[PDB]
Amino acid sequence: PSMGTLMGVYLPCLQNIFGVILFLRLTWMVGTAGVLQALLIVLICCCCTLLTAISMSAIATNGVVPAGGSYFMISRSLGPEFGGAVGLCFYLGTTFAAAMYILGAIEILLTYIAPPAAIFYPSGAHDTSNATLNNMRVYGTIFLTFMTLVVFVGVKYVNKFASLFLACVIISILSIYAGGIKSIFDPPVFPVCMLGNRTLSRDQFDICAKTAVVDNETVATQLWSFFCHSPNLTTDSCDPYFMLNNVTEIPGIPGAAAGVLQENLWSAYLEKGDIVEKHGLPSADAPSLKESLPLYVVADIATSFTVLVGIFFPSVTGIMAGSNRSGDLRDAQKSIPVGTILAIITTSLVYFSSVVLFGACIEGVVLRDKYGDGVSRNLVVGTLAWPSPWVIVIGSFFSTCGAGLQSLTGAPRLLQAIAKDNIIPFLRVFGHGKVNGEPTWALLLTALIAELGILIASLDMVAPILSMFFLMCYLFVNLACAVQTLLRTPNWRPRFKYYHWALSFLGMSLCLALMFVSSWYYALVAMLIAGMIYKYI
Amino acid sequence: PSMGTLMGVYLPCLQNIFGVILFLRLTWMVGTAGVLQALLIVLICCCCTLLTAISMSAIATNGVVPAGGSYFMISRSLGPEFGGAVGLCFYLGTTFAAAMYILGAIEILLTYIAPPAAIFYPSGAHDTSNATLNNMRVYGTIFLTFMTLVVFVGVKYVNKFASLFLACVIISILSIYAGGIKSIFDPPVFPVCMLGNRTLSRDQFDICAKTAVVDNETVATQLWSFFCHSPNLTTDSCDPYFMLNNVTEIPGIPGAAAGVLQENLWSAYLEKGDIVEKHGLPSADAPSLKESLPLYVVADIATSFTVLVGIFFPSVTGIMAGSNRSGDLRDAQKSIPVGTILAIITTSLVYFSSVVLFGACIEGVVLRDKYGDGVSRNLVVGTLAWPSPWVIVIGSFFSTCGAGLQSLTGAPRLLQAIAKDNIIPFLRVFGHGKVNGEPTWALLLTALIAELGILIASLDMVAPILSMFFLMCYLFVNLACAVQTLLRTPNWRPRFKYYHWALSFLGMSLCLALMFVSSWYYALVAMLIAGMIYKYI
Numbered sequence A, B: 001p002s003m004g005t006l007m008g009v010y011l012p013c014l015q016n017i018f019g020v021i022l023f024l025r026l027t028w029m030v031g032t033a034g035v036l037q038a039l040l041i042v043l044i045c046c047c048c049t050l051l052t053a054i055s056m057s058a059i060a061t062n063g064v065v066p067a068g069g070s071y072f073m074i075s076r077s078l079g080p081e082f083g084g085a086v087g088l089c090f091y092l093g094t095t096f097a098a099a100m101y102i103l104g105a106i107e108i109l110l111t112y113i114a115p116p117a118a119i120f121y122p123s124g125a126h127d128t129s130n131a132t133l134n135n136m137r138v139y140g141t142i143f144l145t146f147m148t149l150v151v152f153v154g155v156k157y158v159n160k161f162a163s164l165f166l167a168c169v170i171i172s173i174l175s176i177y178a179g180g181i182k183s184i185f186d187p188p189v190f191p192v193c194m195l196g197n198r199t200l201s202r203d204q205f206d207i208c209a210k211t212a213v214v215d216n217e218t219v220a221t222q223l224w225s226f227f228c229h230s231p232n233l234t235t236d237s238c239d240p241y242f243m244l245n246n247v248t249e250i251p252g253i254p255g256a257a258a259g260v261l262q263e264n265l266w267s268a269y270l271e272k273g274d275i276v277e278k279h280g281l282p283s284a285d286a287p288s289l290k291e292s293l294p295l296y297v298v299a300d301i302a303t304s305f306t307v308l309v310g311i312f313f314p315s316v317t318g319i320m321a322g323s324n325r326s327g328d329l330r331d332a333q334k335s336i337p338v339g340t341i342l343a344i345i346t347t348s349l350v351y352f353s354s355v356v357l358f359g360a361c362i363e364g365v366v367l368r369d370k371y372g373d374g375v376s377r378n379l380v381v382g383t384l385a386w387p388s389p390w391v392i393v394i395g396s397f398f399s400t401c402g403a404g405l406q407s408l409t410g411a412p413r414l415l416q417a418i419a420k421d422n423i424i425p426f427l428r429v430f431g432h433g434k435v436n437g438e439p440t441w442a443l444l445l446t447a448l449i450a451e452l453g454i455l456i457a458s459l460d461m462v463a464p465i466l467s468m469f470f471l472m473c474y475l476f477v478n479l480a481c482a483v484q485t486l487l488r489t490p491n492w493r494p495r496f497k498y499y500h501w502a503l504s505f506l507g508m509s510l511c512l513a514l515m516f517v518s519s520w521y522y523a524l525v526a527m528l529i530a531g532m533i534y535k536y537i
């Protein structure tokens, strides 16, 4: 065993924590919640994990720290009852995170890389979502049946290229910071066309003007034809909101200033179907026709605080997958507690700095465009890249693919280790594998359980389920670290400096309050199931 | 044991089959799906149950038919493995049917009996649904905590008044048929105010006219003020759909004729947010303003075939709850197979005749008004009653309450009988009860499981889950009746005339195809769970 702290503990944690939601759902979160409540969300979601890392350090400073994975540590240091629960919940969390990463990759591919690589098209006027759900499901089944056979053939090639996917993440982060620094002096040019407070999708028209001049003649634009249903300048079928207000271009990225960070400081939540609006523009009040409603930027899902906590939270998970190399380390009780806490601190500072950066540079209306409908169907993050937006797009695609492949390689190892331990004979048949030690049947089971995550067909709907399972895993870790101190069992002696039982109780209570925040109904169900099993034994 | 077929078997089945969906969700189903596809739905949903009744008759013509409930028949005649599965699924079906009946009673009370007995009000312009969901949850918790303590005190009083709730059902049916017969000669008067194809909610304005004459002077009506935002007759802020089309009153119930049954013969499905339209009216095309969209009849939920099958199906369940008196009968192997099949035939003929009746008499636009927003917030069914619409309203309220009370008295008996049998020790603590034999802890468990059904807070969302659980119960009944014939076990000799194994296989396949129709995702989950338990043993 010859492994240091850096390439043994810190780098697997920092490859597992970073991922998809920093590139897809962060600018939306900032522009919806405000910089203040965004920092509140990041501060809350990083204190469940820090106290869980303290409890895992108390796991790590006891006994022998047995070799292989992170399962056997809990299984030998806390009894089988907590160990099976933590292993099963971490298994379910990894298998649904695979489905989340696949859906992220397909969202990036369909809306940004290849727009005409779409099978289903939005027939009719409304319902551009059901076609999108059917369009996500097909490519999800294709990529899942591809990337399970790739794992079924090429484990050694996946472990060989395990560093390139982390390299793509770090290059893509540094590009964001370089463009954000340069945006103080010379901003890029991404113009936003608006009409009063209402912003409108630039993808369907050519030029942002009410009337243009061609051939020494004032002719109505194509934008006149989309709102007035006639190319004549003296008609009265125009809705009075197009008539009483004017069309204005603003800079989408105005550069880093105090005024921009002042404007995007407070929360502007929206209901499903509302139109994204500024606050400081003249806008005369008039009613709008219904047939011009797809000529705007419409908020997709309902936004609140408890939605955004549940969407943000799996950006911070990935602690337990830094102890998979626990046998290979030289001093296992030293590299684990230092390494995981350093990784969590670095990633949390990255999120704080990125929230402040996106709030300071990019204007909030471009921030409130999920899918980037306000700027030319581009990434809102990618407009802040310095060399080109394609750096973030390509690095995000390969990072999501690498994370999905690493989840699909990791989870059957855990189910293999649970099945071979004979803790539960109901899973006994999943102890069968190849002659190399690689699993055979458990790959099929994770391929089928991750399929049900794919068929929900949205990033924003799979993410609260991941929040639920990882919060159950961390809560049982904190219960097992607190009860063993409070009940005074022998062979439980934590040789850690900063450990005390009130920190584990605060971790338990905070990760339970987050569980009731993120989605209260299934937490209310899981309370009933766990209370029923408590009434049995 | 002195019980005949009529008051022993036929009357409990006919009290359990009839219920809430004949009074709330039948006219909506006819007006959405057409008479043809409605008869197709009724014909499909009654052939799962008829073949299941043939299989239960093959249960009934074997052995001794042991005393007490319907659980012990399957448990002693088919082994414990199928018996525990059928008992547990029928338990879950009864406990969620309690929540469905409570939500039906609260819907009838809030929208028809007492409109100002509402805590939450629709604040803002849109989102009249979230206030309604919060308004259903509160009264659901109140009525559930009332009607569990009523069962906890008054079992003898509930069993005493068990016939009055059936009497209310039959009086309410005969009132419908009397008004439907009289509607040939003299129809009632329920006028429907429309504007082109679009119909509009009469509840917010007074008179259906564009301009009225008061004091020898043409003055714009209040209906002019709701569409034009000004009481002046020469303004131009009116949307062109109000300007180019005219306001017309039609009879809502035009009387039974060939032309009415001709018009409502084909399916008119609608998407969420569309406006209910006729087919044979002049209507000039023009765009409509957005601020007049609550002045119409808007379809609440998305409508298709697989939605309507899942909503309709628990109107036919209630077979197994006709064998609860199996010990009390004189000849148990005679009254059960004749009685249950006669009950199913009578209720199915009631549904066929009622579908043809509602299609023939009531006009389809009033049929397509879920909650009755087109006619004065009245029941669409109740406008067809002869003496008064209040007969149907009061009988429907007391029938839903009686059905909920009977479900809450029935389900803990079944969990008691499962727990005392020691088939599953994990439920062993639910064998404790009173000194009378009445259960104590299992009442709390059915009160908490039915609570999670209440918190979904819609009739149309709880009903597919009931469809799922009762289809799983009937499918395991057909599997257990087919495998025992095909595997040639002794002590399985059905002394029934019309029994053959292909009927049980057709029942299995049809109740499985209905399971994939009603909601495919949770059926796809249940397939995985059952296939995993199959791979264990």
Ligand SMILES: C[C@@H]1CC[C@@]2(OC1)O[C@H]1C[C@H]3[C@@H]4CC=C5C[C@@H](OCCC(CO[C@@H]6O[C@H](CO)[C@@H](O[C@H]7O[C@H](CO)[C@@H](O)[C@H](O)[C@H]7O)[C@H](O)[C@H]6O)CO[C@@H]6O[C@H](CO)[C@@H](O[C@H]7O[C@H](CO)[C@@H](O)[C@H](O)[C@H]7O)[C@H](O)[C@H]6O)CC[C@]5(C)[C@H]4CC[C@]3(C)[C@H]1[C@@H]2C
Pocket (backbone or CB within 6 Å): A088, A092, A133, A272, A301, A302, A303, A307, A449, A452, A453, A455, A456, A457, A458, A460, A461, A464, A465, A519, B519, B520, B521, B525, B528, B529, B532
């Ligand atoms: C130990 C051993 C290992 C293996 C095993 O056990 C043994 O492990 C267990 C673990 C099991 C799994 C545990 C949890 C599960 C999650 C569960 O999902 C619950 C709800 C969610 C799924 O929603 C469903 O999604 C499907 C597909 O869309 C819907 O079906 C629809 O499909 C079509 C569409 O074309 C159409 O017919 C209908 O739409 C419908 O049929 C279902 O209806 C739907 O319920 C999460 O979805 C929730 O949906 C809400 C929408 O109302 C959404 O609310 C918000 O929605 C939008 C946001 O997008 C906003 O407008 C608003 O803010 C809100 O309205 C919620 O956000 C969202 O949470 C499914 C089962 C599963 C996976 C368990 C499977 C078994 C399991 C693996 C076992 C094994 C055996």
Ligand SMILES: C[C@@H]1CC[C@@]2(OC1)O[C@H]1C[C@H]3[C@@H]4CC=C5C[C@@H](OCCC(CO[C@@H]6O[C@H](CO)[C@@H](O[C@H]7O[C@H](CO)[C@@H](O)[C@H](O)[C@H]7O)[C@H](O)[C@H]6O)CO[C@@H]6O[C@H](CO)[C@@H](O[C@H]7O[C@H](CO)[C@@H](O)[C@H](O)[C@H]7O)[C@H](O)[C@H]6O)CC[C@]5(C)[C@H]4CC[C@]3(C)[C@H]1[C@@H]2C
Pocket (backbone or CB within 6 Å): A519, A520, A521, A525, A528, A529, A532, B088, B092, B133, B272, B301, B302, B303, B307, B449, B452, B453, B455, B456, B457, B458, B460, B461, B464, B465, B519
């Ligand atoms: C043997 C022993 C006995 C006891 C026990 O085991 C041991 O028995 C088992 C059995 C277990 C139960 C098994 C099944 C269960 C059903 C499961 O529900 C699945 C989905 C449904 C619930 O939907 C959820 O509803 C809640 C509440 O609304 C939502 O939460 C929301 O709440 C607020 C609103 O204010 C807000 O925050 C968000 O909206 C959200 O948080 C959940 O999100 C939601 O998932 C059915 O709902 C489905 O929802 C679809 C909407 O997308 C709908 O699709 C259609 O929707 C409308 C129609 O209304 C149309 O526009 C379209 O046509 C479609 O979009 C679907 O129709 C609908 O199906 C919950 C668990 C439960 C009860 C199990 C509990 C445990 C259990 C009893 C065990 C015990 C231990």
Ligand SMILES: *[C@@H]1O[C@H](CO)[C@@H](O[C@@H]2O[C@H](CO)[C@@H](O)[C@H](O)[C@H]2NC(C)=O)[C@H](O)[C@H]1NC(C)=O
Pocket (backbone or CB within 6 Å): A244, A245, A246, A247, A282, A283, A284
């Ligand atoms: C939209 O912008 C135009 C500018 O082209 C505004 O027009 C006004 O025009 C008159 C004479 O042309 C000027 O005296 C006013 O100062 C202009 N008002 C401004 C610049 O606010 C028009 O009023 C604008 N519409 C709005 C703000 O609703």
Ligand SMILES: *[C@@H]1O[C@H](CO)[C@@H](O[C@@H]2O[C@H](CO)[C@@H](O)[C@H](O)[C@H]2NC(C)=O)[C@H](O)[C@H]1NC(C)=O
Pocket (backbone or CB within 6 Å): A196, A197, A198, A277, A278, A279, A280, A283, A284, A285, A286
């Ligand atoms: C954008 O402008 C409108 C007026 O042109 C602002 O006013 C609101 O408009 C809505 C229409 O849906 C009304 O319901 C509100 O009563 C109006 N509020 C007022 C007049 O205070 C609207 O607030 C602006 N949007 C912003 C500032 O985000």
Ligand SMILES: *[C@@H]1O[C@H](CO)[C@@H](O[C@@H]2O[C@H](CO)[C@@H](O)[C@H](O)[C@H]2NC(C)=O)[C@H](O)[C@H]1NC(C)=O
Pocket (backbone or CB within 6 Å): B244, B245, B246, B247, B282, B283, B284
């Ligand atoms: C709505 O109804 C009115 C009837 O009051 C229609 O008015 C037309 O009126 C002229 C002269 O008053 C008649 O010669 C026409 O025969 C009427 N047309 C009819 C009765 O169809 C008006 O056209 C109607 N609007 C529609 C159908 O869009």
Ligand SMILES: *[C@@H]1O[C@H](CO)[C@@H](O[C@@H]2O[C@H](CO)[C@@H](O)[C@H](O)[C@H]2NC(C)=O)[C@H](O)[C@H]1NC(C)=O
Pocket (backbone or CB within 6 Å): B196, B197, B198, B277, B278, B279, B280, B283, B284, B285, B286
């Ligand atoms: C009611 O009348 C309208 C016209 O006044 C009919 O025409 C359709 O209107 C919709 C508007 O949403 C258009 O998208 C369609 O293209 C129109 N169809 C045509 C002109 O054939 C509408 O069909 C009528 N509703 C019915 C018959 O149910």
Ligand SMILES: [Cl-]
Pocket (backbone or CB within 6 Å): A317, A318, A319, A320, A321
């Ligand atoms: Cl983790």
Ligand SMILES: [Cl-]
Pocket (backbone or CB within 6 Å): B317, B318, B319, B320, B321
């Ligand atoms: Cl039944």
